[PDB]
Amino acid sequence: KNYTLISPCFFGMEKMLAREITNLGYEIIKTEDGRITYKTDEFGIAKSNMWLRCAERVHLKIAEFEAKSFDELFENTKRINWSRYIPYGAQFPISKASSIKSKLYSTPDVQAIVKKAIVESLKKSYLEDGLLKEDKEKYPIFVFIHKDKVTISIDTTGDALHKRGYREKKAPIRETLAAGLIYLTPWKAGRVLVDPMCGSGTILIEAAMIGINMAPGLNREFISEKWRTLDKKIWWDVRKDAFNKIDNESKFKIYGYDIDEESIDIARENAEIAGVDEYIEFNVGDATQFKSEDEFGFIITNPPYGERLEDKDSVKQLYKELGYAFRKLKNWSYYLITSYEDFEYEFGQKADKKRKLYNGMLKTNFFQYPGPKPPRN
Numbered sequence: 256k257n258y259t260l261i262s263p264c265f266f267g268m269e270k271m272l273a274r275e276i277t278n279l280g281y282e283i284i285k286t287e288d289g290r291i292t293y294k295t296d297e298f299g300i301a302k303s304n305m306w307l308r309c310a311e312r313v314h315l316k317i318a319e320f321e322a323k324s325f326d327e328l329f330e331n332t333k334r335i336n337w338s339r340y341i342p343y344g345a346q347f348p349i350s351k352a353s354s355i356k357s358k359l360y361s362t363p364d365v366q367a368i369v370k371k372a373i374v375e376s377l378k379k380s381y382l383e384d385g386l387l388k389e390d391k392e393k394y395p396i397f398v399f400i401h402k403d404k405v406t407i408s409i410d411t412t413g414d415a416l417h418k419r420g421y422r423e424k425k426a427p428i429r430e431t432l433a434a435g436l437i438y439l440t441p442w443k444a445g446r447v448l449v450d451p452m453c454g455s456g457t458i459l460i461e462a463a464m465i466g467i468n469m470a471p472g473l474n475r476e477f478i479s480e481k482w483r484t485l486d487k488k489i490w491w492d493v494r495k496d497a498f499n500k501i502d503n504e505s506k507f508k509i510y511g512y513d514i515d516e517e518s519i520d521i522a523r524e525n526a527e528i529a530g531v532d533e534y535i536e537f538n539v540g541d542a543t544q545f546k547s548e549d550e551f552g553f554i555i556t557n558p559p560y561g562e563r564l565e566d567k568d569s570v571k572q573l574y575k576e577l578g579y580a581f582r583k584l585k586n587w588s589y590y591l592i593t594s595y596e597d598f599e600y601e602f603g604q605k606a607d608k609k610r611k612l613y614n615g616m617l618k619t620n621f622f623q624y625p626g627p628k629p630p631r632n
């Protein structure tokens with residue numbers, strides 16, 4: 256059997272996520288702002304959770320229909336054969352509802368009506384006279400309404416995917432965003448890579464895991480691993496496969512610096528937890544003094560944004576100082592993410608590309624500065 260899955264992502268991450276899904280061998284059905292819909296074989300749920308670095312989670316799509324009234328929402332939800340997806344005794348909390356530009360804007364009421372519909376559907380299938388028991392494993396139901404089109408799905412993930420298990424940290428960049436940053440560059444294992452304001456090390460940890468082909472989900476668990484409705488052998492084979500795919504022969508080193516000594520301590524701890532401590536060296540250091548004799552290196556970094564009035568002036572000077580230091584490097588490429596709108600002006604250089612991205616509550620841009628190209632003829 257095949258599945259239709261949906262993976263939400265931050266706006267601006269759709270291209271990277273689509274590329275990852277394509278690399279897993281799956282067909283993309285629909286690309287929309289903040290979510291990719293795709294078709295997979297029976298390995299799809301396990302493989303998607305195991306391997307996708309830019310997905311915030313992996314949903315199993317159950318149904319899509321129009322609903323302009325609560326009666327219509329109820330009737331359409333109830334007619335779904337829920338017993339096919341929710342087994343006897345299973346828990347089915349309606350974990351979340353989102354409604355955008357739709358008549359059914361009250362999400363808690365959407366949740367209650369969907370709950371009632373599913374209870375009615377199951378009661379009919381399971382001929383349940385007494386209490387419909389909900390004491391076994393959990394199938395969290397998600398409802399998404401956009402311009403009156405309702406999508407109902409089941410969460411296969413549980414804890415948000417960005418939680419790989421290594422984050423034990425100030426204000427770290429999201430793991431999924433960090434992986435997307437790496438993917439937006441030409442960096443490959445073996446090439447010099449430095450994050451000179453590395454904080455708790457997220458960007459470098461994500462890059463190291465990409466470099467040794469360590470699956471993001473390798474050291475965490477997923478709610479669907481407990482589902483009686485799945486063949487447990489599939490999840491098992493997918494995990495074993497992922498372990499075997501780790502590149503154990505490759506040797507490389509990438510580097511992080513920060514002036515916050517506690518952040519370096521945390522970064523080292525986090526890399527050990529992630530299992531990539533052998534590929535990263537973290538040190539206290541000042542990015543404005545960064546120098547190298549190597550050429551053709553990469554910098555990928557997340558500097559302070561200077562959002563507070565009290566910080567704005569020092570951050571502007573930092574940007575100028577970074578520009579000076581980075582331009583003295585020999586044919587390096589550098590990439591910086593910041594919400595500071597006028598970054599290019601203070602940095603002293605126009606980017607090749609500027610991509611709009613999101614740490615959710617923050618509207619950030621990724622400024623890309625690939626090194627000079629060879630001469631023309």
Ligand SMILES: Nc1nc2c(ncn2[C@@H]2O[C@H](COP(=O)(O)OP(=O)(O)OP(=O)(O)O)[C@@H](O)[C@H]2O)c(=O)[nH]1
Pocket residue numbers: 425426427428429451452453454455456457458512513514515518540541542543557558559560573
């Ligand atoms: N090396 C260096 N670090 C600096 C300098 N100025 C500020 N920083 C650090 O640069 C980091 C960039 O800001 P953050 O937003 O905190 O980076 P981060 O939150 O650690 O991002 P993550 O990698 O996900 O943890 C901060 O941890 C600051 O301590 C500097 O002049 N040199």
